[PDB]
């Protein structure tokens, strides 16, 4: 199937902190596999999935020293952004980065990513051509011009097409899974003359899933309540969707569960 790598990086300043905290989290196929945190007693990239312990000490020493460089890059960048936005001393500020590459099922590069946010809002991103930058804010154009003048994107294009794909291939080798939903309906009467059917889906991975309720053969988009998909904490996820029905008519309501691990969608009903 398709594959990906991402590094999510955060630098955080708070008024009661002299220096920013820097965190970098690496992902392969949307699961964390390495993490660097400057708050640690001895900061270093650390393995976060057992298959990563395969890597030797000079891997970790090299990644760790890059992270120390990135930490300083974020510090300087947070200081410059403060001036760009005419923000004074004495607030909390955040710089975020996501970067990485998407691979098709043939393991070829589909797309590389490099995006930044300041205060949780889009600041500047490398466009899909890996050659030009998009920046919305007036304050952001200062960065775009600098990076255009320095030709920074050339180095980023080379990473996203080169090392990002090459090392992602190495990682997919070293760690060479879906779990299907298990579904049931629970019965809860909301009032006299009405009943809530709750369709649960439990124990599934990946997290993406869809639950619907159908009348005859009628999807009921509004009127139906749901929860955001949530981690069970064991690696799997959960969701439910519920709808209010006249009692006795429970049998004319069918729930459907859509998930990429299923041979076909599940259909189910309340079972006395």
């Amino acid at each position: 199937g398709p594959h990906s790598m991402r590094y999510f990086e955060t630098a955080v300043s708070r008024p009661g902190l002299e220096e920013p905290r820097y965190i970098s989290v690496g992902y392969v196929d949307n699961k964390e596999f390495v993490r660097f945190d400057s708050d640690a007693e001895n900061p270093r990239y650390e393995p976060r999935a057992p298959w990563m312990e395969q890597e030797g000490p000079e891997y970790w020493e090299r990644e760790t020293q890059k992270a120390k460089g990135q930490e300083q890059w974020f510090r300087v960048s947070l200081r410059n952004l403060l001036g760009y936005y005419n923000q004074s001393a004495g607030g909390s500020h955040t710089l975020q980065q996501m970067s990485g590459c998407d691979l098709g099922s043939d393991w070829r590069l589909l797309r590389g990513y490099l995006q930044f946010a300041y205060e949780g809002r889009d600041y500047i991103a490398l466009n899909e051509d890996l050659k030009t930058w998009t920046a919305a804010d007036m304050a952001a154009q200062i960065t775009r011009r600098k990076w255009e003048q320095s030709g920074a994107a050339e180095h980023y294009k080379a990473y996203l097409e080169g090392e990002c794909v090459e090392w992602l291939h190495r990682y997919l080798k070293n760690g060479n899974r879906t779990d299907s939903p298990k579904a049931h309906v629970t019965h809860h009467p909301r009032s006299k003359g009405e009943v809530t059917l709750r369709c649960w889906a439990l124990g599934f991975y990946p997290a993406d899933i869809t639950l619907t309720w159908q009348l005859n053969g009628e999807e009921l988009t509004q009127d139906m309540e749901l929860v955001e998909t949530r981690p069970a904490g064991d690696g799997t996820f959960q969701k439910w969707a519920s709808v209010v029905v006249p009692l006795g008519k429970e049998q004319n309501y069918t729930c459907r569960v859509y998930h990429e691990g299923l041979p076909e969608p599940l259909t189910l009903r309340w079972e006395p």
Partner: peptide, 9 residues
């Protein structure tokens, strides 16, 4: 393998 940013913002 994490990317190395060059020029600061």
């Amino acid at each position: 393998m994490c990317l190395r940013l060059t020029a600061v913002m």
